Design a protein around this ligand. Structure first.
Ligand SMILES: Cn1cc(CCC(=O)O)c2ccccc21
Length: 167
């Protein structure tokens, strides 16, 4: 048993809910929250910016030190950093950004990072301003992730469309 509440079950291991991932993380304090990051860990806007804002910029400070030491991530790659006040850990995962012309085939590689963690709270990768089709992102998630994933869908209308179109 875990502390996630109000999720709809999509498969054996994937759950979904219309929720603000920031508000969800604050309530659950999951072991792992997934940040939909970029390779520079520049949390300007979106989920990245919203999680970073909720940490009072401590996520960005930690991320800048990580990049100064290690250099940028790969598209499709990840790193584990602190969860600050939101979670034990934050798994920063880089999905391809369609609005920058990155290969959508890298989405599967991005989701494979989730398999290193038994339970995660996550947004849909490569959605919103990354320009991928969220329906596709959910299909890749279900077909790639084998560990238990709790997906927070912010957009109400999108949530309803993801559920009603899910095969
Ligand atoms: C990766 N990513 C996912 C989302 C989540 C979309 C949603 O749950 O509605 C998002 C929103 C704004 C900017 C980037 C975003």
């Amino acid at each position: 048993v875990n502390s996630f509440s109000g999720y709809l079950k999509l498969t054996d291991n994937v759950y979904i809910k219309n929720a603000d991932i920031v508000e969800e993380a604050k309530k659950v304090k999951p072991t792992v929250v997934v940040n939909a990051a970029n390779v520079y860990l520049k949390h300007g806007g979106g989920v990245a910016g919203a999680l970073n804002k909720a940490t009072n910029n401590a996520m960005q400070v930690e991320s800048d030190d990580y990049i100064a030491t290690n250099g940028p991530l790969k598209v499709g790659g990840s790193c584990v950093l602190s969860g600050h006040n939101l979670a034990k850990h934050c798994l920063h995962v880089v999905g391809p950004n369609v609005n920058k012309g990155e290969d959508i085939q890298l989405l599967k590689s991005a989701y494979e990072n989730f398999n290193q963690h038994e339970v995660l709270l996550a947004p849909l990768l490569s959605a919103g301003i990354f320009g991928a089709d969220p329906i596709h992102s959910l299909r890749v998630c279900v077909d790639t992730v084998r560990t238990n994933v709790y997906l927070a869908v912010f957009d109400k209308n999108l949530y309803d469309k993801l559920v009603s179109s899910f095969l």
